[PDB]
């Protein structure tokens, strides 16, 4: 049946090339021999035999078979290398996580500079992303690694969230200690910079706001190489962490340790004056220092900017053409 995974062989796919390098194994593009559908097979190598099957993959196999959404990537099946006949101990063959092949990723479309985003296009990009995030947050899962390279895009304008390797369940009642500093520094929330380890789903929201701004500026908003440096840049725009705006900031481990040069005032509306008013409000709420005062995914979807966006009118972004190469 369709459900018996791990037995079908990777012979069934004609490998086209390598689309990316993996934290545990390299990702190849491929075509299904039977249907012609284009897939993306991730290589999962157990040959290291240090801790066996990677937990990062186990989280992607656990969560993505639960999550069904138009804005969340689909794991179609898991297939294997030709296994050694009747000798599992000698067998060191690897496993592959078959996914849908998304044509482009946000990092490449903006970095080449070839993509031009109108307001309506941004609305459709954000509405899908938030709908996906809301679905995931409602199921009490946290992505924990939102990045521009993790927002895949089909030419149609469909957006899908992608790298669930660092994702884990969130419990509101029991504040169990999780890992720390999970999101990449440029998209990392202020609380994790100060090390809460008991984080809220609002960590993913901060990142998406960073993306919202980056879509308007075409340049990431908070680019720094050091955790304190990031806090300064964030502090300049969003305001310095202080007890009035963040009553519980004093409980965070590094609040006294990590300090901005000054107690900067919030300037977000001024520095983003060119952003439309409907969107600027969304940014102010998404980039709020206090995770308890930071807006939710549902709140972003019930928005003047996003509420009246119709997902039927996808309106594809201005993707590169031959004249655009000229």
């Amino acid at each position: 049946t369709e459900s018996d995974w791990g037995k079908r062989c990777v012979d069934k796919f004609d490998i086209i090339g390598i689309i990316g390098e993996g934290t545990y194994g390299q990702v190849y593009k491929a075509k299904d021999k039977d249907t012609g559908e284009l897939v993306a097979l991730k290589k999962v190598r157990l040959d290291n035999e240090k801790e066996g099957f990677p937990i990062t993959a186990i989280r992607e196999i656990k969560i993505l078979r639960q999550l069904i959404h138009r804005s969340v990537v689909n794991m179609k099946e898991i297939v294997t290398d030709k296994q050694d006949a009747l000798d599992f101990k000698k067998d060191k063959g690897a496993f592959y996580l078959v996914f849908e092949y998304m044509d482009h990723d946000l990092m490449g479309l903006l970095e080449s500079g070839l993509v031009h985003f109108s307001e309506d296009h941004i609305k459709s990009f954000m509405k899908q992303l938030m709908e996906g995030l809301e679905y995931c947050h409602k199921k009490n899962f946290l992505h924990r690694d939102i990045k521009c390279s993790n927002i895949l895009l089909n030419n149609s304008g469909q957006i899908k969230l992608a790298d669930f390797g660092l994702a884990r369940l969130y419990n509101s009642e029991e504040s169990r200690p999780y890992t720390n500093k999970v999101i990449t520094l440029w998209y990392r929330p202020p609380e994790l910079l100060l090390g809460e380890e008991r984080y809220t789903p609002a960590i993913d929201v901060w990142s998406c706001g960073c993306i919202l701004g980056e879509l308007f500026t075409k340049k990431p908003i908070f680019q720094a190489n050091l955790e304190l440096a990031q806090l300064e840049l964030i502090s300049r725009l969003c305001g310095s962490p202080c007890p009035a705006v963040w009553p519980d900031v004093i409980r965070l481990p590094y609040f006294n340790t990590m300090k901005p040069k000054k107690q900067y005032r919030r300037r977000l509306r001024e520095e983003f004056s060119f952003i439309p008013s409907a969107a600027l409000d969304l940014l102010d709420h998404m980039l709020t220092l206090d995770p308890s005062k930071r807006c939710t995914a549902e709140q972003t979807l019930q928005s003047d900017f996003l509420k009246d966006v119709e997902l039927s009118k996808m309106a594809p972004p201005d993707l590169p053409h031959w004249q655009d190469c000229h």
């Binding site: 018996d4 937990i55 656990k62």
Partner: protein, 248 residues
């Protein structure tokens, strides 16, 4: 989309172990030992009850697709617990599971692990993942016992006695093939039903429909009492054979 992980009692007459000449009593003895091994090893390591149960469910499912005589029961158990730890985010190092398994097993039993215990276990992880069809997410009677108990209102101390007794019945049912016969939701009801009959409590009154004599229905639709009795019989039989007697 998703696999079927439930069989009929009559089907257990045709497991690989049975057809290789193992009699029904032995396969059920072997299952209790392997499950209790998993339970005892993980408890010594401080593992969450869900992690113990997930390993046990993997274990039970495994020996519905494979034989007991060709695949050792204690290596498999250790492998299941190792994977369960990663699935349920309560991870342990394979060497530590071996250490504890050695502490608890005698010399004959630990002979199954062979010359290199860690290797025999880590190697099996491949077969386990393919066997359980990479369906790693598992739900357990515990969450439903609490979800349903939360909707009961009445004497605080009569409900907490019901829950603990039912909770003990859940831990005991892991030694059996009930995990392979009935969804966890039904198990949770069955153990509430069993504890209710024994504690001479009438759970219908604690519900929001004090007059709905079939209270299980407001939690689990389409569950006949015939199902709940079959489950109770199977749980009570364990107490009858063993020296342990009903807690009450």
């Amino acid at each position: 989309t998703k696999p079927c992980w439930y069989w009929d009692k009559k089907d257990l007459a045709h497991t690989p172990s049975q057809l290789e000449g193992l009699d029904p009593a032995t396969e059920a003895r072997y299952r209790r030992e392997g499950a209790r091994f998993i339970f005892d090893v993980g408890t010594r390591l401080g593992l969450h009850y869900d992690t113990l149960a997930t390993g046990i469910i993997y274990f039970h499912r495994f020996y519905m697709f494979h034989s007991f005589k060709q695949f050792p029961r204690y290596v498999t158990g250790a492998c299941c617990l190792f994977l369960a730890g990663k699935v349920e985010e309560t991870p342990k190092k394979c060497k530590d599971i071996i250490k504890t398994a050695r502490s608890l097993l005698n010399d004959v039993q630990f002979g199954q692990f062979g010359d290199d215990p860690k290797e025999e276990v880590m190697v099996l992880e491949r077969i386990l993942l393919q066997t359980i069809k990479f369906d790693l997410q598992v739900e357990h009677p515990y969450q439903f016992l609490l979800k349903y108990a939360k909707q009961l209102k009445g004497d605080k101390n009569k409900i907490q006695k019901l829950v603990q007794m039912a909770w003990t019945f859940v831990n005991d049912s892991l030694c059996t093939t009930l995990s392979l016969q009935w969804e966890p939701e039904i198990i949770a009801v069955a153990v509430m039903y069993l504890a209710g009959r024994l504690c001479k409590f009438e759970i219908q009154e604690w519900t929001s429909k004090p007059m709905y004599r079939r209270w299980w229905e407001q939690f689990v639709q389409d569950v006949p009492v015939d199902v709940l009795e079959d489950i109770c019989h199977q749980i009570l039989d364990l107490y009858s054979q063993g020296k342990q007697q009903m807690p009450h």
